[PDB]
């Protein structure tokens, strides 16, 4: 089915499916049950920044999430992405709410992928950077309830006019162009991603989270993947 590799910013602890009992960041490899998690001191109402990095030499997917004036949270996982994802993929952001809710607002998003071959001066690269989103963002594939242009931002989940996050919402945004992550002649392959988000909820228990993901180019939101499934997984296995 869809091959998913995601770094989740999980705001709601679903202890029955493996979530530690606190908001946390985790690395998901084809399963919502993170292979590795780190405690995340999430701040309701504050704008945060997440950095995701990986390279084919060290074979380690790492993520660093921070808020201004606070200590960051980090989580790493040794995994060879060549053995998990296809040659061509699509990168995106996903978010959902269930019985509980929060806004899943993205203010900016940047991604860089480089493949260096065994040739002199040969490097294939792709880099995009969104610091403001438009109502008609042709270079993005919006799925579910995701929309753009609301104050130049990307709203992954439904938000009513009065600025209230709706529940049972799921939305994803994928960059239009496929991304080449593996090439036979590459000696070094690497990608870096960064995005600033604003999670806000009128409740003491916001849910469910935001995830940066990499999937097969033809990925679609799995049916019933609202809430704890973050719009990425069809079930909790």
């Amino acid at each position: 089915a869809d091959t998913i590799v995601a770094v989740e910013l999980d705001t709601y602890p679903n202890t029955d499916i493996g979530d530690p009992s606190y908001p946390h960041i985790g690395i998901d490899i084809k399963s919502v049950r993170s292979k590795k998690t780190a405690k995340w001191n999430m701040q309701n109402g504050k704008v945060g920044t997440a950095h995701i990095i990986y390279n084919s030499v060290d074979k380690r997917l790492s993520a660093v999430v921070s808020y201004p004036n606070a200590d960051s949270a980090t989580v790493s996982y040794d995994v060879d992405l060549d053995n998990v994802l296809p040659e061509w993929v699509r990168v995106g952001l996903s978010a959902s709410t269930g019985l509980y809710k929060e806004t899943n607002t993205i203010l900016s998003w940047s991604f860089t992928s480089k493949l260096k071959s065994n040739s002199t001066h040969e490097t294939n690269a792709l880099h995009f950077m969104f610091n403001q989103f438009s109502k008609d963002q042709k270079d993005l594939i919006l799925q579910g309830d995701a929309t753009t242009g609301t104050d130049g931002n990307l709203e992954l989940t439904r938000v009513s006019s009065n600025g209230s996050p709706q529940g049972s919402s799921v939305g994803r945004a994928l960059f239009y162009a496929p991304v080449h992550i593996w090439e036979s002649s590459a000696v070094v392959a690497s990608f870096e991603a960064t995005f600033t988000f604003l999670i806000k909820s009128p409740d003491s228990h916001p849910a469910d989270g935001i995830a940066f993901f990499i999937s097969n180019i033809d990925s679609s939101i799995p049916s019933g993947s609202t809430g704890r499934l973050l719009g990425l997984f069809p079930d909790a296995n």
């Binding site: 202890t15 009992s21 606190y22």
Partner: peptide, 6 residues
């Protein structure tokens, strides 16, 4: 493991 939410 774990069970105390936040």
């Amino acid at each position: 493991m774990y069970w105390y939410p936040y």
